[PDB]
């Protein structure tokens, strides 16, 4: 019994089917009063929701799905036609995520890509019918943030105005990524201080908008 599939079941036993909102609340309560998990959470989630609404992106790239929590948070707010692509290298995780989405009825807007970002990213354009991303949400291995950003930029997936939202910029932390993005003239950055999911520890999200 996986701690991951543990949650997947809880949602199936407590979430109002086809109701993204309910799913999110099920996942959060479980991780709050029982086992802890690396879900962005509701605090940072609300910032996500706010940023997403502002930019109302057409094409959004998620790096690291885990249990699909943020994939649901993001997809439930997508306008008709908008598609969300989420890369997950762990087959067990990409599995739970897919169900998580199917249960929220959000499955028609999300295309899950099982594999490692560094490998999948350069295949993105031709194999998935993609030109440029409108938004990118980074939440996978912390040492992968910078390399994938340089990778994303090399494959011409970044466009003037593309929005990069990054989680855990303070904890666990992503020094190199932050340093690179805030010092680069190709990125206009803004910080949004919040709290690490399920507990009161300072951590924030970083928005880095690509300028060209």
Ligand X SMILES: Nc1ncnc2c1ncn2[C@@H]1O[C@H](/C=C/CNC(=O)c2cc([N+](=O)[O-])cc(O)c2O)[C@@H](O)[C@H]1O
Q: Which active-site residues does the annotation give?
A: 139, 142, 167-168, 197
Length of the chain: 212
Lay out the site mask for ligand X across 180-209 (x = CB under 6 A, - = otherwise). Answer: ----------------x-------------
> Smaller CB distance to ligand X: residue 148 or 181?
148
Per-residue DSSP letter, 123: G
> Smaller CB distance to Mg ion: residue 43 or 82?
43
CA distances from 132 to 3, 8, 41, 57, 126 (A): 36, 32, 28, 11, 12
Q: Which of positions 78-117 make contact with ligand X (CB under 6 A)?
A: 87-90, 93, 116-117
Identify the residue among 29, 38, 58, 99 touching ligand X (CB under 6 A): 38
172 lies in the site for ligand X, by CB under 6 A: yes
The closest alpha carbon to 72, from 46, 114, 110, 36, belongs to 110
Residue count, binding to ligand X (CB under 6 A)? 20
Q: How many CB atoms lie within 10 A of CB 70?
A: 26
Measure the N-to-C terminal CA separation of the chain; round to a whole number of Å.
47
Asked if 126 contacts 132 with a C-beta cutoff of 8 angstroms, the reply is: no
Query: In the complex, which residues of this chain contact ligand X (CB under 6 A)?
Result: 38, 40, 64, 66, 87-90, 93, 116-118, 139-141, 144, 167-168, 172, 196
């Amino acid at each position: 019994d996986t701690k991951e599939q543990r949650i997947l079941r809880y949602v199936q036993q407590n979430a109002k089917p086809g109701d993204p909102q309910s799913v999110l609340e099920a996942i959060d309560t479980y991780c709050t009063q029982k086992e802890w998990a690396m879900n962005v959470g509701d605090a940072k989630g609300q910032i996500m929701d706010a940023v997403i609404r502002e930019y109302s992106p057409s094409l959004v790239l998620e790096l690291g799905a885990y249990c699909g929590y943020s994939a649901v948070r993001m997809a439930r707010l997508l306008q008709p036609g908008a598609r969300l692509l989420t890369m997950e290298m762990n087959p067990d995780y990409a599995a739970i995520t897919q169900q998580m989405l199917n249960f929220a009825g959000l499955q028609d807007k999300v295309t899950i890509l099982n594999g490692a970002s560094q490998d999948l990213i350069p295949q993105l354009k031709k194999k998935y019918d993609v030109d440029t991303l409108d938004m990118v949400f980074l939440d996978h291995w912390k040492d992968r943030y910078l390399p994938d950003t340089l990778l994303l930029e090399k494959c011409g997936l970044l466009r003037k105005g593309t929005v990069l939202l990054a989680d855990n910029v303070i904890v666990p932390g992503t020094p190199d990524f932050l340093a690179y993005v805030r010092g680069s003239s190709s990125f206009e950055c803004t910080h949004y201080s919040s709290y690490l999911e399920y507990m009161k520890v300072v951590d924030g999200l970083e928005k880095a908008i690509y300028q060209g």
